[PDB]
Amino acid sequence: PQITLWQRPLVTIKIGGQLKEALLDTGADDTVLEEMSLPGRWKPKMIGGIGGFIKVRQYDQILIEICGHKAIGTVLVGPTPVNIIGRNLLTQIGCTLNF
Amino acid sequence: PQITLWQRPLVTIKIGGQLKEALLDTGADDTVLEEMSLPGRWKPKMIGGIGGFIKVRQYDQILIEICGHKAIGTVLVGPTPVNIIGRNLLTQIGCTLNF
Ligand SMILES: O=C(N[C@H]1c2ccccc2C[C@H]1O)[C@H](OCc1cccc(F)c1)[C@H](O)[C@@H](O)[C@@H](OCc1cccc(F)c1)C(=O)N[C@H]1c2ccccc2C[C@H]1O
Numbered sequence: 001p002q003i004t005l006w007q008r009p010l011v012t013i014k015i016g017g018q019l020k021e022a023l024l025d026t027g028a029d030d031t032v033l034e035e036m037s038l039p040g041r042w043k044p045k046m047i048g049g050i051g052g053f054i055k056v057r058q059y060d061q062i063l064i065e066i067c068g069h070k071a072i073g074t075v076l077v078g079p080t081p082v083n084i085i086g087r088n089l090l091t092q093i094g095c096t097l098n099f
Numbered sequence: 100p101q102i103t104l105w106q107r108p109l110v111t112i113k114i115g116g117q118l119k120e121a122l123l124d125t126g127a128d129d130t131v132l133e134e135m136s137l138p139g140r141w142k143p144k145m146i147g148g149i150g151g152f153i154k155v156r157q158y159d160q161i162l163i164e165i166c167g168h169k170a171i172g173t174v175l176v177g178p179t180p181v182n183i184i185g186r187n188l189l190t191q192i193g194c195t196l197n198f
Binding site: 002005023024025028029032052054067084087095 | 100101102103104105107108122123124125126127128131146147148149150151152153166168179180183186189190192193194195196197198
């Protein structure tokens with residue numbers, strides 16, 4: 001699908017059997033989701049954004065479906081204002097910027 | 100062109116007669132550049148991202164050239180860690196997300 005940017009590029013993702021809305025964010029290196037429960041052990045990570053840094057929990061090899069496309073990768077969980085699908089997963093679904 | 104997301108989507112922009120490197124950010128509603136001098140009057144604004152909010156100066160009707168494409172829009176100036184080309188300008192150059 002081709003997504004224009006007149007509005008936020010929000011899509012439905014499925015993770016842990018639940019549907020959530022997330023932003024396709026080319027400006028995000030990684031994928032960070034709002035506080036939730038994920039399986040396995042996590043490692044600590046610090047990510048910096050426009051307003052500073054936040055501590056998140058890093059879970060690896062997590063199954064996540066984005067707009068119907070299945071991806072398996074690293075997902076960060078922390079106090080993010082919105083669910084963000086970053087480049088690590090955008091590349092898995094073959095997402096590109098075009099103009 | 101078609102930009103892959105294996106690396107950050109950085110492009111050269113021309114603003115106020117200056118050449119700068121900026122990130123094509125679909126997750127950014129607005130465009131914010133690091134501290135610099137721009138003409139006209141400005142209004143203060145607070146923008147929030149990961150980490151919190153930062154105070155920026157809002158300039159309107161600013162002309163910017165993104166990869167050769169001329170676009171006009173509001174440009175925010177402030178303590179952003181990286182130059183960001185947001186949706187308000189990405190739409191003007193016909194940039195879309197595709198997968
Ligand atoms: O922090 C970033 N990447 C980091 C990141 C993100 C997730 C995981 C890892 C990493 C590392 C970095 O790539 C990105 O910023 C560039 C950036 C790039 C590299 C290093 C940096 F410091 C900063 C960031 O994900 C933006 O894509 C965007 O995030 C989603 C969002 C949406 C709505 C409300 C929110 F509050 C947050 C965002 O902050 N948007 C806000 C914005 C920006 C400019 C002007 C106005 C407004 C308002 C709002 O849209």
